[PDB]
DNA sequence: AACAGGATGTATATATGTGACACGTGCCTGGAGACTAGGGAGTAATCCCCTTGGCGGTTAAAACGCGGGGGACAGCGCGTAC
DNA sequence: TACGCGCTGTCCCCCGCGTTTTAACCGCCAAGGGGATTACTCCCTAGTCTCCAGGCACGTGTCACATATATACATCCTGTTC
């Protein structure tokens, strides 16, 4: 039921939506998130610069993986990634996902 | 067709059950190959038949030790770290809620008395 | 009951929902094809009393899909290495050797070898 | 209950249960902050999220499972970093 | 030239062979091994030491792969 | 006839001062003596699987010569890609 | 020389919903039929180039044991870090 | 808040490397042959437009279930101390 023009984004925005900075987030991963992973590998004991330099890690990974999907989702002129563009971009970087998609 | 494949489909004249056709689809669709023989589908098709059972077989005996029926993706992961062959085959993937298998080393696990070594005062 | 094949309608569905019983239609939804059911047939070969998960079957359903998709890619790449333009089963008979090692070629093999020539020696 | 054999006791039902070790949100809400400085506005669904959650925590746990290995080779047990810098350059990474 | 021959000959016989296949077949086969040796250095720096042992040179396949 | 010479293998042809060389090319100080028979298996392990899809490539094109472009695909394949020897 | 303590892992019967299947209708698209038709392959002669070895003539890379320096392995230990 | 465990300090003790024999092995020079890899010519059997037909198999309603996932009782094994 459209209602308005989006555009670039924030369709009826007025005072009815909300948004916020979103500085940094790579903080919400925690040491149990990184503990966790730990023990599915099989660590005793983690050291704490290992909890800054895991989520660097994750922030590198996650990095180099966007920009593989924001490419084919251009392409495809969607706003969106749905299930394909990560697959896509996943099977480039040798990180090929089963199952989600395909 | 009296006498023709009417009755007898592609898949079933070679004895699978696998689509086939479909593969063949698939070949012209993914531009492979200018020209298609018939052999070429059916014998993909054969190395997937082969495949999809033997993967089901091996994960299908894991359910039974996980003391499950349904096949969850925790058995398919076994299935595949077990067989060292069909890592070779994937492995360098990822699957959605596969699991790790249990690779504890030995490094941890301090058998000996945790005292210390000389006497028992640590 | 006479002929349809004559088609002014192609897309067809639902468009305004001038419907006279039952309702029932929506937009044509583009074809998803899934080894699902094939996957489960095999299943029940190996193992009657297992069933599945539909997690499963999306791990499964994409495993089928990109393993046809290097089959098929490497021997695309082989059918360029020499410059013939037929692909044939002796064009994958190569083909399963470089990616299926070990025993997986065996059985690849034997399994492919058996079904072509049992395609054909029939009728 | 010694901090050092209750890790061994995580990691037997960790490597065995299967779950999303990650918060969601919190992973949502960084992928969407990385998202905004390659493209503004660029939406993401929820399978997308969850795909790269669990790619993200695969490619982790083999991490972790490789500097695991390099602190033996040390002769040692727990991860410093320099066992991220080892394994990482190694594998074509890093450099 | 001998060594190439052979392992070739202990699964398929009756295969010849060129001088420029064979240098390819060098070369491969030799940088692979020297990216190895400074792959494993950083093995043995990071266990205090100069050495190459085959506990540096196993960790260092198996991180980067080709044993798995 | 089948009786002929196996008795351990060319793969001594790789000499001590070869695989000392081969180390001096990286960055090395000292190796340790089972290095020397650590390099023969690892080359083996290498050679076996590169090998094999050379010799798939020459059986599927029915010849017998191995070419310097049935080298190079069975590199590209997993890495290693030799530049040079093609076309 | 070996027992106490509190929680996690077991059986065993106990509830639920969502995942799954079965009807009953409905309609293209994917297979199937059956000849006419032009172009990639089976199959014959042609032709030079490729690999296998004679076949000698110096020379730079192995092959191996001894020597004296030094670096990896390993023992404890007080205080830092998880 | 506490001990498990980095790090320092130190030399067993077991070798990687330097220095000489040691001449046999890798290596290139001047030519032939038998076998094998591309041009050139003939003819041939699948898929491929004609040009139509009917069955599978995918959704939209309509009913009605079966195992996964955790709960109430009831009761043992494991891990880490004193």
Redesign the pocket.
Same mark, same amino acid.
């Given at each position: 039921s459209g209602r308005g023009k989006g555009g670039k984004g924030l369709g009826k925005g007025g005072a009815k939506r909300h948004r916020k900075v979103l500085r940094d987030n790579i903080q919400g991963i925690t040491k149990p998130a990184i503990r966790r992973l730990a023990r599915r590998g099989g660590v005793?004991?983690?050291?704490?610069?290992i909890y800054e330099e895991t989520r660097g890690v994750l922030k590198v990974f996650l990095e180099n993986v966007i920009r593989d999907a924001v490419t084919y989702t251009e392409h495809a002129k969607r706003k969106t990634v749905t299930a394909m563009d990560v697959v896509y971009a996943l099977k480039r970087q040798g990180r090929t996902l089963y199952g989600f998609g395909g | 067709?009296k006498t023709?494949?009417?009755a007898?489909?592609?898949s079933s004249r070679a004895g699978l059950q696998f689509?086939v056709?479909?593969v063949?689809?698939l070949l012209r669709k993914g531009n492979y190959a200018e020209?298609?023989?018939?052999g070429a589908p059916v014998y993909l098709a054969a190395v997937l038949e082969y495949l999809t059972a033997e993967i089901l077989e091996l994960a299908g005996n894991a359910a039974r030790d996980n003391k499950?029926?349904?096949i969850?993706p925790r058995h398919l992961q076994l299935a595949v770290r077990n067989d060292e062959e069909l890592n070779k085959l994937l492995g360098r993937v990822t699957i959605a809620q596969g699991g790790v298998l249990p690779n504890i080393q030995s490094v941890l696990l301090?058998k000996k008395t945790?005292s210390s070594?000389?006497a028992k005062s640590? | 009951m006479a /002929?349809?094949?004559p088609?002014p309608? =192609?897309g067809? $569905?639902k468009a305004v929902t001038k419907t006279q019983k /039952?309702?029932?239609?929506?937009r044509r =939804?583009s074809? $998803?094809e899934s080894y699902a059911?094939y996957v489960?047939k095999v299943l029940k070969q190996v193992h009657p009393d297992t069933?599945?998960?539909?997690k499963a079957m999306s791990i499964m359903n994409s495993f089928v899909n990109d393993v046809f998709e290097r089959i098929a890619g490497e021997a695309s790449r082989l059918a360029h290495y020499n410059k013939?333009?037929?692909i044939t089963s002796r064009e994958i008979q190569t083909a399963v050797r470089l990616l299926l090692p070990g025993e997986l070629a065996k059985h690849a093999v034997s399994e492919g070898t058996k079904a072509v020539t049992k395609y054909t020696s029939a009728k | 209950?010694?901090?050092?054999?209750?890790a061994?006791?995580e990691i037997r039902?960790y490597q065995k249960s299967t779950e999303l070790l990650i918060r969601k949100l919190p992973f949502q809400r960084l992928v969407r902050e990385i998202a905004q400085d390659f493209k503004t506005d660029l939406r993401f669904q929820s399978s997308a999220v969850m795909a790269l959650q669990e790619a993200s925590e695969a490619y982790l746990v083999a991490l972790f499972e490789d500097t695991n290995l390099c602190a033996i080779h040390a002769?040692?047990?727990?991860i410093?970093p320099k066992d991220i810098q080892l394994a990482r350059r190694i594998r074509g990474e890093r450099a």
């Open positions: 005793k004991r983690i050291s704490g610069l | 067709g023709r494949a009417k007898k489909t592609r689509p056709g479909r063949h689809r020209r298609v023989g018939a499950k029926t349904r969850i301090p945790e070594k000389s640590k | /002929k349809s094949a088609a309608k =192609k067809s $569905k /039952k309702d029932g239609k929506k =939804k074809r $998803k059911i489960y069933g599945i998960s539909s013939r333009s037929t | 209950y010694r901090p050092g054999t209750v061994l006791r039902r002769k040692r047990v727990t410093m």
